[PDB]
Amino acid sequence: SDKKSLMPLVGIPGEIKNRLNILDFVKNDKFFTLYVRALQVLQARDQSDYSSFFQLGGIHGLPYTEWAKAQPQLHLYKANYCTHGTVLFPTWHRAYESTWEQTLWEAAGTVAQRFTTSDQAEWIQAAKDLRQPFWDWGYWPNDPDFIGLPDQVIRDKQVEITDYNGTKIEVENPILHYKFHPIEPTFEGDFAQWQTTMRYPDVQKQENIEGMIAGIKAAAPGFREWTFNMLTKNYTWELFSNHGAVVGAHANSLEMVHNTVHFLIGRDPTLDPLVPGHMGSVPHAAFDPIFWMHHCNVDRLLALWQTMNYDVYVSEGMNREATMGLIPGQVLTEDSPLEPFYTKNQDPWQSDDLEDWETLGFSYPDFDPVKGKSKEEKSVYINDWVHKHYG
C-alpha cells in the first residue's frame, strides 16, 4: 500500500477566505505583488519538479507522464488526466484548481517572509488571505467598451509590484505568457515551435492580442445571455456538467459554455484552417496562466448552481474516452477516482469529498451575504443575485 502520492491535495488550512474577481484583485497592491512573485517562483522552478508551473500545468494534458507518484506503473496509459465530456467534468476541475491553488499559496508564503519593511505583518497576513482570482466572463454591465480582464492579464509586458524594501519596481509579466524551459518533446506540430504560450494566433503563427480583445467584447452580451440560461435553465446534473457524447448536444451545459471561452483566448474562428493557441487546445491549455482564472470562474459558477440546486450532484454517466485515471467503458459515480489527486490519507479524491467547496479552503464574494443561512435561504437569495447580475 504505502504512499501513492508525493503531493496530496489538501487545499488551504486556517480561515476560509474568498477568491476575488480579477478586476478588484489587481487593485489590491499586496495581493497582486504576492501573486506575481509566487508565479515567478513556480515558473522558475525545474520542469521536472512536480510542484512547478510546468508539472502542474502538465497534469491537464501533455506530457503523458505520472504526476507526483511514489511508485511507477508497469504499463502507463498515455492520455490526458482531465476528464472532458463526462459527468465528472466540474468536480475533477475543482480538485485540479485547488491543487494549483495550494502550490501557489505555499509559494507565496515563503515570498511574504522575504519582505523587510515594517508592514510585513500585513504582508504575512496577505499571504494566507491570498487566493486564485476569477474572470467573470458572464457579467456584461451593458457597456460595449467593457472587458472582464484587466491590462495586467492580457496586455502589459511589464507589471508593477512592490519590492521587499517598499520600492515600486517593474518585472516581466508572468501572467501574460509562460516561457518553456525547454519546449516539451512530446509537443507536436505548431506547439513544438513556440517557446512561450500563445493566445489567439494569426495566419503567421503569432499572437493577435487586439483581435482577441475585440472578439471578447463583441460576444460579451451573448455570453451574459448564455451564462444566465446555463444557471437557471438546467435542473439536472447530466445537462449541466458535460457537453454531451456527441459534442454540441448539450448547448446549455457549463462545459459547453466553458468551451467557447477557451476559443475566445485560444482560437480565431474566422481562420481557414484553424490555428489554435495553447488555450485553444485541451492537451496544451493548462500552460497558459489565464487557464487558472477561467477555471476559477468555472468552479464559481458550479458553486452558484450548487447553491440553487442543492443536494443535486454527480449523476451516473458513461466514460467513453480513456483518461490516465479512468477505464474506457466504465460507469462514473460520485465515488469514482479523481486522479492524480490524493487525500492527506493517500486515498484518491472523489467528487463526494469536495461537494462542499469550503472543505478546500475557499469561498466566493457572492456567498458573503448569506453566510450561516439555510440551503433554502441561500437558494432564494442567490437565484435573485444571478437574476440581478446576469439577467
Binding site: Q73, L74, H75, L76, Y77, E316, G317, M318, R320, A322, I327, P328, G329, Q330, V331, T333, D335, S336, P337
Partner: protein
C-alpha cells in the same frame, strides 16, 4: 436516458452471459438474449465490479479457476483489477492478489471445439487471448 453499459471484447468476439450453479461467460459473435452483451463496470473499493445487464449476473472467481456469472454479489470473488496492457486499447482483468501477481482473464476453449469461455491462468504479456478492450 438509461445507461447503455459497455461491451467487453476480445479481438472482435464480445462477452455474453445467460441466466440460471454460476453460468459461463461465452465469448463469441451472437448475443443470446436482451442485454446479454452489455456490462456495467463500477469502481468497487480499490478495484472494479462487473455486472451483466441481461442476466443480472456478477463476474465471479469460481472454484476451479474459471470466471462464471453469479446471482448474489460476493465481495471475496466479485472484485477485479483492470490494468493496461501497454499497447492499443487492450487491458488485463485481474484477480486482486496480495501485492499483485494475480491470475488474469483468458479467452480460450475448455477442451477445444468451443465454446470459447473465460478461464484463469498466469499472465503472459504476449498472449493475445488475455487482451481485453471495452466499447460503449
Amino acid at each position: 436516458l438509461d445507461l447503455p453499459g459497455t461491451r467487453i471484447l476480445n479481438g472482435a468476439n464480445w462477452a455474453n452471459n445467460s441466466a440460471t450453479s454460476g453460468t459461463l461467460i461465452i465469448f463469441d459473435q451472437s448475443t443470446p438474449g436482451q442485454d446479454a452483451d452489455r456490462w456495467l463496470i463500477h469502481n468497487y473499493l480499490d478495484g472494479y465490479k462487473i455486472f451483466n445487464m441481461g442476466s443480472n449476473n456478477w463476474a465471479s472467481v469460481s472454484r476451479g479457476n474459471t470466471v462464471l456469472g453469479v446471482s448474489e454479489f460476493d465481495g471475496q470473488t466479485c472484485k477485479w483489477s483492470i490494468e493496461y496492457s501497454g499497447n492499443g486499447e487492450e487491458f488485463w482483468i485481474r484477480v486482486p492478489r496480495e501485492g499483485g501477481g494475480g491470475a488474469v482473464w483468458t479467452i480460450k476453449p475448455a477442451s477445444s471445439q468451443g465454446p470459447t469461455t473465460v478461464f484463469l491462468d498466469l499472465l503472459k504479456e504476449t498472449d493475445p487471448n488475455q487482451r481485453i478492450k471495452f466499447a460503449v
